[PDB]
Amino acid sequence: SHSMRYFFTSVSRPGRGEPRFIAVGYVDDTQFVRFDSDAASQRMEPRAPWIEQEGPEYWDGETRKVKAHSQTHRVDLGTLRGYYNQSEAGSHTVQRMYGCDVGSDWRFLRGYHQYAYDGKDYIALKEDLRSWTAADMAAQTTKHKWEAAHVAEQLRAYLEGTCVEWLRRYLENGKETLQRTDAPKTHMTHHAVSDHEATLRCWALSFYPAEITLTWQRDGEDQTQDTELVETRPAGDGTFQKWAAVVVPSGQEQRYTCHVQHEGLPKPLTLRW
C-alpha cells in the first residue's frame, strides 16, 4: 500500500500583509515538495532527489497550481472570519489535506479531501467521494455550495484518476528509496532505578516507513502495566525512531521480551536481556 498526500496551512496576519502559507507534499512518509510564502523562490521546490528528474513544465505547472491554492486559502480565511462573526484583529488558521491511497495492486484504494478551521473539523469528503461531512452550520453552507457546484465529482476525477497516476509515476521514479523498506535496527538498554528494580528499554532505530509496533511480554504474555511507549519520531535523515520501556524486578530481566513488528521484517523480532 502507498499514498500521496498534500498538506496546506494558512495563517492570517492581521497586523500587516497576507497570510503565511505553507504547502508540503508526501509520498508515504517521504516529503517530496514544499512551498513557503515566506521563502525567496516563490516556486514549488523539490525535497527529494527523485522529483528533481521532473522538467521545467512540471515545476511551472506546480508553481502555478500551488499559488492558486495559496489565494484560495487567503480568500477562505476571509470567508470564514465572516461566517464565524470574528473581528479582523485576530490571527486564524485554515488547514487542508487531500490525496489518494493505492493498494498492493497499485490500484485506487481511497481518496481524501478534508478541511479544518482553527484546528477543528470544518468539512470532509466522505469515503464514497460523493458526500460531505459538515461539522457545524458554517460548514453546512460550504456543503450546500459544493453540492450545487458538483465539487465532489471534480475531486473524484482527480482522486481516482490523476492523483493515482502521479503516485504511480513517483513510486517508479523514486523506487530505490520509496519501494525499499528499512527494517528497524533494534537493541535493548538497562537502567538501574534502585537496588530492587531496573528499566529495560527496547530501541527501534533507522526504520522506514514510520508505521511500527513495539510490545513487551513477560513469560510470553502481553504486558501493559509499568510500560512506557514514546511517540515515533523522525531521525532527520528520512528514517524514524521509537522506543518502549518496562520497569522490572532486578534479577527478573530474563522473563521479559520485546517484540517488534515492521513491514521490513519477514517474521517479527524478539529481543531479550
Binding site: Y6, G25, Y58, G61, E62, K65, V66, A68, H69, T72, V75, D76, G78, T79, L80, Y83, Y98, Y115, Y122, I123, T142, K145, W146, A149, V151, Q154, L155, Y158, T162, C163, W166
Partner: peptide, 11 residues
C-alpha cells in the same frame, strides 16, 4: 501533482 482547481469554501 496538485489538484488543478481547488474549491473555495465560500464558492
Amino acid at each position: 501533482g496538485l489538484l488543478p482547481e481547488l474549491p473555495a469554501v465560500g464558492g
